[PDB]
Amino acid sequence: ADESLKDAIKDPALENKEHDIGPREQVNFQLLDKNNETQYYHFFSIKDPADVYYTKKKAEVELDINTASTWKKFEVYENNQKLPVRLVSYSPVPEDHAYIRFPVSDGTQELKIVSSTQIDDGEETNYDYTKLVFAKPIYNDPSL
Amino acid sequence: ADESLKDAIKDPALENKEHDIGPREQVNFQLLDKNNETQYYHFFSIKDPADVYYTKKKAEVELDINTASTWKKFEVYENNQKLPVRLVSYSPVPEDHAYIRFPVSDGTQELKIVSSTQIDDGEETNYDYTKLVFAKPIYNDPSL
Amino acid sequence: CPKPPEIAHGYVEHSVRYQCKNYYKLRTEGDGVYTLNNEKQWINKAVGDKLPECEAVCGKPKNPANILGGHLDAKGSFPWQAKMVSHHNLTTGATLINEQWLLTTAKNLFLNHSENATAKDIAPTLTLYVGKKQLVEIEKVVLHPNYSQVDIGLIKLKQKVSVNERVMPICLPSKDYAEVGRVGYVSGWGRNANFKFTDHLKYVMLPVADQDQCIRHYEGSTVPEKKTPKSPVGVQPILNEHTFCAGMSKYQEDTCYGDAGSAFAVHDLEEDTWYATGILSFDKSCAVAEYGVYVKVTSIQDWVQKTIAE
Amino acid sequence: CPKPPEIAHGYVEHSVRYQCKNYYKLRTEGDGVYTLNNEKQWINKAVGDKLPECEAVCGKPKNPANILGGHLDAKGSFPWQAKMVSHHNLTTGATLINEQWLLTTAKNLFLNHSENATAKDIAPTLTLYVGKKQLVEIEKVVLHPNYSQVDIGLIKLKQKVSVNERVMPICLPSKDYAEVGRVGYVSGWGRNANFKFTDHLKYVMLPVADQDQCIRHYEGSTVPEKKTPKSPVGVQPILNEHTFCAGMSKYQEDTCYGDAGSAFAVHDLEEDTWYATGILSFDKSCAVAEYGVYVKVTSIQDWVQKTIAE
Amino acid sequence: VLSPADKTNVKAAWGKVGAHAGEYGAEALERMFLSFPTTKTYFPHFDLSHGSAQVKGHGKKVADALTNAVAHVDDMPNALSALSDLHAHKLRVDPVNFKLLSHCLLVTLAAHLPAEFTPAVHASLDKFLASVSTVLTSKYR
Amino acid sequence: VLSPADKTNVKAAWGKVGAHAGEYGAEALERMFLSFPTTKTYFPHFDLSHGSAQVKGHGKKVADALTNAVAHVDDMPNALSALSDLHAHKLRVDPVNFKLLSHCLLVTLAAHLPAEFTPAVHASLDKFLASVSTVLTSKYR
Amino acid sequence: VHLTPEEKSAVTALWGKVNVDEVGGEALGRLLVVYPWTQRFFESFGDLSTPDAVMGNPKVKAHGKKVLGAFSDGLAHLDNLKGTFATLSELHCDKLHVDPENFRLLGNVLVCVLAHHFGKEFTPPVQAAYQKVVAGVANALAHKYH
Amino acid sequence: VHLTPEEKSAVTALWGKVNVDEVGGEALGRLLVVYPWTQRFFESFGDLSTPDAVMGNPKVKAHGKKVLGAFSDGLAHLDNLKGTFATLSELHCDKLHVDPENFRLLGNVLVCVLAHHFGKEFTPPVQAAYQKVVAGVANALAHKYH
Amino acid sequence: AEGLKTKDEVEKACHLAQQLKEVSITLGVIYRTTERHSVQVEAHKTAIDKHADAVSRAVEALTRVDVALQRLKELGKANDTKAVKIIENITSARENLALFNNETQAVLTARDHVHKHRAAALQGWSDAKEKGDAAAEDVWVLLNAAKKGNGSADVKAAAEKCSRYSSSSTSETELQKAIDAAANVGGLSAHKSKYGDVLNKFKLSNASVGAVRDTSGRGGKHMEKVNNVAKLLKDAEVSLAAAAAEIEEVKNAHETKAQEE
Amino acid sequence: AEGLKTKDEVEKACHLAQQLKEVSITLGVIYRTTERHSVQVEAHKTAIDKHADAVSRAVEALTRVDVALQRLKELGKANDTKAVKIIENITSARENLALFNNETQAVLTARDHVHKHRAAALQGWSDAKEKGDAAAEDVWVLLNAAKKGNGSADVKAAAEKCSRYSSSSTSETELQKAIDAAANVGGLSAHKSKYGDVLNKFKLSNASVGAVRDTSGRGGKHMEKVNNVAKLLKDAEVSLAAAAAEIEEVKNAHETKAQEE
Ligand SMILES: *[C@@H]1O[C@H](CO)[C@@H](O)[C@H](O)[C@H]1NC(C)=O
Ligand SMILES: *[C@@H]1O[C@H](CO)[C@@H](O)[C@H](O)[C@H]1NC(C)=O
Ligand SMILES: *[C@@H]1O[C@H](CO)[C@@H](O)[C@H](O)[C@H]1NC(C)=O
Secondary structure, X not given: OOOOHHHHOOOHHHEOOOOOOOOEEEEOEEEEXXXXXXXXXXXXXXXXXXXXXOOOOOEEEEEEEOOHHHEEEEEEEEOOEEOOOEEEEEXXXXXXXXXXXXXXXXXXXXXXXXEEEEOOOOOEEEEEEEEEEEOOXXXXXXXX | OOOOHHHHXXXXXXXXXXXXXXXXXXXOEEEEOOOOOEOHHHHHHXXXXXXXXXXXXXXXXXXXXXXXXXXXXXXXXXXXXXXOOEEEEEEOOOOOEEEEEEEEOXXXXXXXXXXXXXXXXXXXXXXXXXXXXXXXXXXXXOOO | OOOOOXXXXXXXXXXXXXXXXXXXXXXOOOOOEEEEOOOOOEEEOOOEOOOOEEEEOOOOOOOXXXXXXXXXXXXOOOOXXXXXXXXXXXXXXXXXXXXXXXXXXXXXXXOOOOOOOOHHHHHHHOEEEEOOOEEOOEXXXXXXXXXXXXXXXXXXXXXXXXXXXXXXXXXXXXXXXXOEOEEXXXXXXXXXXXXXXXXXXXXXXXXXXXXXXXXXXXXXXXXXXXXXXXXXXXXXXXXXXXXXXXXXXXXXXOOOOOOOOOEEEEEEOOOOEEEEEEEEEEOOOOOOOOOXXXXXXXXXXXXXXXXXXX | OOOOXXXXXXXXXXXXXXXXXXXXXXXXXXXXXXXXXOOXXXXXXXXXXXXXXXXXXXXXXXXXXOOOOOOEOOOOOOOOEEEEEOOOOOEEEEEEEEOOEEEEOHHHHOOOOOOOOOHHHHHHHOEEEEOOOEEOOEEEEEEOOOOOOOOOEEEEEOOOOOOOOOOOOOEOOOOOOOOEOEEEEEEEOOEOOOOOEOOOOEEEEEEEEOHHHHHHHHOOOOOOOOOOOOOOOOOOOOOOOOEEEEOOOOOOOOOOOOOOOOEEEEEEOOOOEEEEEEEXXXXXXXXXXXXXXXXXXXXXXXXXXXXXXX | OOOHHHHHHHHHHHHOOHHHHHHHHHHHHHHHHHHOHHHHHHOOOOOOOOOOHHHHHHHHHHHHHHHHHHHOOOOHHHHHHHHHHHHHHHOOOOOHHHHHHHHHHHHHXXXXXXXXXXXXXXXXXXXXXXXXXXXXXXXXX | OOOHHHHHHHHHHHHOOHHHHHHHHHHHHHHHHXXXXXXXXXXXXXXXXXXXXXXXXXXXXXXXXXXXXXXXOOOHHXXXXXXXXXHHHHOOOOOHHHHHHHHHHHHHHHHHOHHHOOHHHHHHHHHHHHHHHHHHHOOOO | OOOOHHHXXXXXXXXXXXXXXXXXXXXXXXXXXXXXXXXXXXXXXXXXOXXXXXXXXXXXXXXXXXXXXXXXXXXXOOOOHHHHOHXXXXXXXXXXXXXXXXXXXXXXXXXXXXHHHHHHHOOHHHHHHHHHHHHHHHHHHOHHHO | OOOOHHHHHHHHHHHXXXXXXXXXXXXXXXXXXXXXXXXXXXXXXXXXOOHHHHHHOHXXXXXXXXXXXXXXXXXXXXXXXXXXXXXXXXXXXXXXXOOOHHHHHHHHHXXXXXXXXXXXXXXXXXXXXHHHHHHHHHHHHXXXXX | OOOOOOHHHHHHHHHHHHHHHXXXXXXXXXXXXXXXXXXXXXXXXXXXXXXXXXXXXXXXXXXXHHHOOOHHHOOOOOOOOOOOOHHHHOHHHHHXXXXXXXXXXXXXXXXXXXXXXXXXXXXXXXXXXXXXXXXXXXXXXXXXXOOOOOOOOHHHHHHHOOOOOOOOOOOHHHHHHHHHHHXXXXXXXXXXXXXHHHHHHHHHHHHHHHHHHHHHHHHHHHHHHHHHHHHHHHHOHHHHHHHHHHHOOOOHHHHHHHOXX | OOOOOOHHHHHHHHHHHHHHHHHHHHHHHHHHHOHHHHHHHHHHHHHHHHHHHHOHHHHHHHHHHHXXXXXXXXXXXXXXXXXXXXXXXXXXXXXXXXXXXXXXHHHHHHHHHXXXXXXXXXXXXXXXXXXXXXXXXXXXXXXHHXXXXXXXOHXXXXXXXXXXXXXXXXOHHHHHHHHHHHHOOOOOOOOHHHHHHHHXXXXXXXXXXXXXXXXXXXXXXXXXXXXXXXXXHHHOHHHHHHHHHHHOOOOHHHHHHHOOO
């Protein structure tokens, strides 16, 4: 799923599928590079605030990313270990938004994003480190 | 022959036949009626002088008569007995002259003509007595 | 053009169609129409620049019919008939063969003139008439080279004469109707049974007569060694292979002094045209002499055509 | 008539043949020829006294072929194209449907005017242009009863305009080429990539586009309950069964502000005639919005015919 | 044209004229000068009055001409030949004039001979003077 | 028309602009008033001189409008809606003027960012200001 | 034309003796016989071929009478000859187209028949007077021809 | 148009530093890429589809040079702009029928490429001076259109 | 019987008299209109005679081959070579001779017919002269009675204006149209059964005139066919002359035979 | 190599340069003359796609009757009544479908051809720009040499009067006529084998332009035939729909059979 995101959105089962069912929190975040200034490409590509959906086990953050067709590698790390990222809905080409979810452990605030963007067959632009900072910690609420 | 003269000229054998062969005398005559004045119809109808042709036996007078087609009875008498009149030549219709011959006894001068003229089927005009007087007597001359 | 009206945003292309007036005819190849140019030229797509000309019809009198004897000319059924008078008031016939010319006899021409006289002498002498009183003037006169055998003249009129119902030429025949069984029409200005020159043109139908019967009548013969002057009037007609004889009428009408030069005109019923089959030579016969005699026109053909050229 | 010459004894029968000048045509039954009378009347043996009239051709430009993008109009290949400017110097399109009338859009008409405004209000406001600078004056204006649905006006010109190579009406189609697979030609006076009103008439070829793809583009839908304003520029085109959409160019040329009222003109190669298949309604699309959209002319047919009658 | 029939009639009728042939000839001329005064211009020096010896004698000539004609009627132009030329050429008599005298000769014969003047004869008598009056004229020019 | 490719380029390029987005906005305007003096007639009361605080701040607004646009580039007309009406209706800005500033914004980005101004970006950057400069104008009337 | 009183007197007195049931018809049938082409106008009569048929044919004398009468009218008014025959002139010239020469031809055959009945009593002066008459008639009868 | 001496001086001095074997061709190839409809006139070059092909295609810079030169001639004589391009105006307007809007479109892509090579040194006053130039050129080049 | 009426019925009677008189005139001009055909058919006779003599030599010759094909009805009817090949060269000769005695006879019958019709023409004329002259005379005693007939005095004027002859000829048409105007008003006449005659003799007469133009026309057709085929015989006269005399040795089929028995 | 001659041969060349230059122009206008056909054949593709989906339902149905005529290749190939009378109502259905996959393929081949020719058009253009621009350039070094070339001095005048571009377009005609006047006089050029190229690439190029008008024309013919027969299928869609489903009981000839064995 997170090895190639623009291949991922090619699955027809995912188009305009519903991701909005259930209880959710809205948490604004910041997206910063390794000098702690905004990562402007990611800043621009991901919707702020972020829908966080409640589950039985851990809260699952949902990310809203445009130009999904030009996104390639999107890896999200919590305490430097890989989260199992998966694609839930995609919105076709005048829209070109991909919708992804991953579990986060109660208490998490910072998140690591290893990403890359490539147009068609061209130059792949690797984005080494992107720090995602929720404006407040994330806590699951199974009570809903 | 002398019963009907206009029937006589109808014989085709007689047309423009030669009557002029041989020796001949020319004798002037007069034609008179019973009062001894000229018979003007006969006067006009018969050529004067008259060719008289010489033969072995008696001289034969030849008479030249126009309008033969309107002549009917032409009888010629010598001493009140009938002469055998015959037609020798005829000259066709712009001409209409008949040529007749009869023998006369040597010494004859006067001659009797009983004649008639009829046009087609119409009125027959009888000419009872016509006296023909030769200006000199007729004598045959077998010596030629 | 009593000018055509204009239409909005449109133009006119002019044509004329030439047509010949009454008693005349179109001559050209030459369908007759002529279209105006951008060159403002009048152009027939067949003959181009060349106009047609109008040529008189012949043998088509406007009122057709339907000399001792009869047939007063009520209508003017004989528009080709000309009355020519010699210097001394002697009336004589001539017929109009086209717009400028009339046939006649050498004889009529020679009246009041010596055998010495030539054409130049005779032409000013004559007075000529067409139609009613119509006086046509007279330019030259020309005689057939065989005048003493073929008795024929030609008259040239100073100008052309206007053709109409009363004045109009007769057709020269391609065919020759000189044969017995044909019938003909003779007009005439000649004398009548009071031996007066006639007051009114008259005409008579006559059959054409067997040429040998006619010969045997006038001379005695056929064969020339047996020829003698048998002619009922004083004078002998001219008789050869260029002549033919017409009989007497049904009613014993005949053609007398003055009637020479009048045409023996045979009407062809199939093509409804009037041809001049002959011209009258011997007009002396009258009561007394069984055949008037004509010179076949077919036999003077190549000569008349030849003369017309001058 | 530069009068024909006379011929001897002959007369002339006059004819004229009427012909319509360049870029016009004969209307009548009515073989066109007219012969002069003895009544000196001009008479066609079919229609008699009635003249023909000359009617403008449509769909035959004198110099044919063969907006952000290209195709400068070198020749004047679009003689039916009119440039109309509203009161406040806003340039807008209209196309010439016959000698007196031009189609346009309700919208172009309503510029610098209230929804309140009626036709009488709007007509004096406008300035209209054909051909080069040619200023045609403007009598009335009439709007389609469905103006808010069918976006269409009609302009009546005070008089008829003279047709020629640069000024001439377009044909209204019997057939309807609104289908995909057809190609069309749009002329225009509208803006270009400097968003300047263009200095020279230009034109572009555009395919006609699938109606559903176009719908789904501008609204979200097909089905009306899922309809939302998806339009790439700020404003929504009018989309119904009386409209059709034309795609973008081969080279991404497209049709921008001012290009409404310009005709989507489809050239029919078999009959070599130029039909107006549609009129441009939505000229807003430009770079950013995939389809300019036209109202099918076949659908306003019976209305335009009806209006012309007054 | 003088058929056999005509020829017969003329002879038979002119016979019945007889010795009066002379006297008729004069009576005939007289009528002509009285009826048609223009014919007198051919006879300037003649005394033209009633029964003038000059008229009376001249009639005997004309009479005899005629008798001659019926004498050989089957050839008139030979018989009348010397007369052809006399009237035609020397005297130049207008052919209309013969038809006058023709008719006076017909009026004259009528008066003196009622019984022979049957229509049939009137025919052939007229033909006969036609035939003659022609032969004198046909050399006119 | 802004394909995924374009969209990526505009973000990636406008990112590399960063906090200077404000300062370019003003540099861009300045060029416009200097290059095309007619655009000054829309800004009467502004001090238009060099580095004028009024110019400099206004550029921060224009900068931000643009950043907004790339922030939601997948719907521009909703984002720019309140600006649609401002220029179209209230301010009535002649649509030619946007194409000037469009270009000045292109000249400006060129100067400050040589490495990203590859032809491919020059394309989508122009489309982007096209797409925007359209949306403001399409409510013109 | 003018006529001396003793001409007119010799004329009228003779005309008195003229049989009006015969003479005219005899003048007509002789014309048919002598100038056979006039037969053309009259063949409606019956057989006109022989002279006996003509002279005998009852429509001929029947006709002659009317003609003879027509001549009587002439002797009646000799000063207006034109007028008396003015209508008759129309019948022959305008409707019929008789050639005017046959009027005189007929007037003469009349004078012949006159001389036939009246013998020596038809005298050269009397003919010469009648000649004036059958002329004046023939002309007047011919007047509508011009 | 008129140009202040320090405008022309800043202009010419900058034009000095302009690489004449490259810039012109780069201006042209961007035009092909940014406003693709101009490709229509040049497709004789080779592949014009991708931006790399265009920028790489040897006939393009080859061409740009001649164009760039054509612009050098402008800066040379700025008073007779009409005349200098008078013939060039004929090639595009009378023979070719290029829409005059693509002259300015190209003059601008040139100014873009200018600003690309010269960075901060291509100053608002210098652009403003060059703006006068790529206009004057575009117009003069369009003069034979009227 | 009493004549008169208004100034109309005087005219109606005036026009009748004029047409009634004019029938005897018009029908005359018409008979003479046909003299042409009479004399023409006569000359056809003349020429038909002439032709009979013209071809006499050629028929006398073709007769000889008929009479020599008789004594040849013994040994000659069968394939005599030089004999049976003669009928092969007489092929067209006997064709024309067949046409001759055919077509000549036609112009002879055409001839006979044209006289008869011209006679019926003639007869009809003479009758309608009587009937017409009679009738016109009757309606002239009313017309003259109206002269001083106690008058309508515009009726008086309406007589003396009247003249004896019509100004023109008469159709069958004009005539009936004169009887027509006469019948209805002013049955004063009531003679109409006699006017029936003058018209019926009229009709009958014209009928026959037309008959001769028609019947003489087809005569001239036939005559033309006569003249032509007669030339074929006269020019083939020499041919036929030696054709009958070429049956010479066919007579030797007699002479060399008839002696020996 | 040496250029010059009289004041004639300067302009015999001047005209060459002008035509030689103008080949790279004219050939351009002509390529663009064919954009129409390129975009037209493209929209044909668009529509051909659209039709394939338009008739999809009707082909899927007619396929069902093919695949149900297969298990029918056991008891169904022989006179099944309600089956064998189906092919009677599918008579025209399979007619059109035959025409469809025929005519669609034609506009596809027409399509492919129009591009290739337009490519050969294109190739030819680019060459003749080189060859021509080259050549024109050469005969301009003689033309510029004649400017101050020691001169005939009326030759001098005859250069500066000369201008770079022709006033007009170029036929193949005009071109050869420029090479013509150039060959004979002033073999001074003697380059004529290269002018041969620019003309031969010219000819070759125009050849292909004409090829597309011709080949695109017959495309539009075929496309029209496509649109029509596609309507027959879309409107017979309902027909065919129940036609394949009427083979229902033909499947009972399977079901009622295949169980019992
Ligand atoms: C038309 O334009 C003028 C220009 O000043 C403006 O003032 C006016 O309000 C406009 N009217 C409408 C109805 O748009
Ligand atoms: C009968 O004669 C009249 C003139 O009297 C004419 O109208 C008609 O045609 C003639 N014949 C026929 C058959 O009508
Ligand atoms: C090639 O184009 C020229 C015009 O440049 C034309 O004369 C010629 O006809 C064209 N070729 C053919 C095969 O038509």
